Structures are given as C-alpha cells and as structure tokens.
Scaffold this active site. Structure first.
Site, mmCIF file in Angstrom:
data_model
loop_
_atom_site.group_PDB
_atom_site.id
_atom_site.type_symbol
_atom_site.label_atom_id
_atom_site.label_comp_id
_atom_site.label_asym_id
_atom_site.label_seq_id
_atom_site.Cartn_x
_atom_site.Cartn_y
_atom_site.Cartn_z
ATOM 1 N N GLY A 46 28.676 74.719 13.894
ATOM 2 C CA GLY A 46 27.964 74.933 15.140
ATOM 3 C C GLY A 46 27.798 76.402 15.479
ATOM 4 O O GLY A 46 26.744 76.832 15.974
ATOM 5 N N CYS A 47 28.842 77.178 15.214
ATOM 6 C CA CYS A 47 28.829 78.582 15.543
ATOM 7 C C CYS A 47 27.876 79.384 14.646
ATOM 8 O O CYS A 47 27.222 80.354 15.055
ATOM 9 C CB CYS A 47 30.258 79.140 15.535
#
Ligand code: NA
Ligand code: NA
Length: 158
Positions: A46-47
């Site tokens: 996600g990051c």
C-alpha cells in the site's frame, strides 16, 4: 479560522531528517504549499502504491508551486533504499521518534490481541504557505488519493 488542525509552535522548528541526508523544517517551507502524507511502512504494497501515485503527479504539484513530503518512522537508510528502488523524486522524512507523527496526531490506538496497540494511521495534510493545516485526510484510502489531494490543493491555492 480556516485551520482544521492546530500544531504546537515547536512543531514547525523540529529538525526533520530526510532521505539523502539533509534536514528540513516545516517553517523552512514558508511561502509555498506543502503536502505531507504519512504512511505506516516503507516498501510494503500500500505504501509503495501511494508513493508511486504521488510521484507520477509531481509535475502537477510543481505547477502549483507545492512540495511533497512522505513520512514514516523508518530509518534514513530504509528511505534511501525505497526512494532509489521506486524512483521517487520527492523526499521522505525519517520520523524515527514519531515527533512529527504525534504533532499531526497520526499515532492511533487499536484494542487488538488483548493489547492496546499504537501505530501510524495513513493520513495526509495540506499546509498553506503561512503554515496552516487547511485540509486533512485520515484512514486514507490509497486508490484515488493522490488525485484527490491534488484536486483539493488546486481548489485551495485559489
Ligand atoms: Na522498495
Ligand atoms: Na508551507
């Protein structure tokens, strides 16, 4: 009046360690817009998605005179490796002591595992040229997020 969050005065003078070995401060960004996005961990799905999304929009943020900073509590070396692997052309703050995270109140607690567990909640903020926090996004949904932040910035910059 237009601020959605109030930061302690000292926050603006905290030395923020960046990828690449320099430091910045929020006060040093006076005169231009600043996007500050907090994320929980370097080099996770996600990051990475979020960072790549902001990176792709860098020319649009430039058009507005804005700068971007990503923030997590990962080390400078971790950040250097993440930036190099992904090709990020904006800096990452190594907030190892969570001083900046606490100022923005992004360290949130969850009752899990029979424990009180604290961690970074994905959050983004728009800081005006005069250092006011004028918009916030918390519990961020990565999909569509950088586009929404850019749109909001443009709307505010007028
Ligand atoms: Na990486
Ligand atoms: Na600013």
């Amino acid at each position: 009046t237009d601020a959605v969050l109030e930061l302690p005065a000292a926050t603006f003078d905290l030395p923020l360690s960046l990828s690449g070995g320099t430091q910045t401060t929020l006060r040093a960004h006076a005169g231009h817009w600043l996007v500050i996005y907090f994320y929980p961990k370097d080099s996770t799905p996600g990051c990475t998605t979020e960072g790549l999304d902001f990176n792709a929009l860098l020319p649009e943020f430039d058009k507005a005179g804005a700068k971007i900073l990503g923030v997590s509590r990962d080390s400078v070396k971790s950040h250097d490796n993440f930036c190099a692997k992904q090709g990020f052309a904006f800096p990452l703050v190594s907030d190892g002591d969570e001083a900046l995270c606490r100022a923005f109140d992004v360290i949130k607690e969850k009752n899990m595992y029979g424990k009180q567990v604290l961690g970074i909640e994905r959050s983004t903020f728009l800081l005006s040229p005069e250092g006011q926090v004028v918009q916030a996004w918390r519990k961020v949904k990565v999909a569509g997020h950088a586009d929404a932040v850019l749109a909001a910035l443009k709307a505010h910059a007028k």
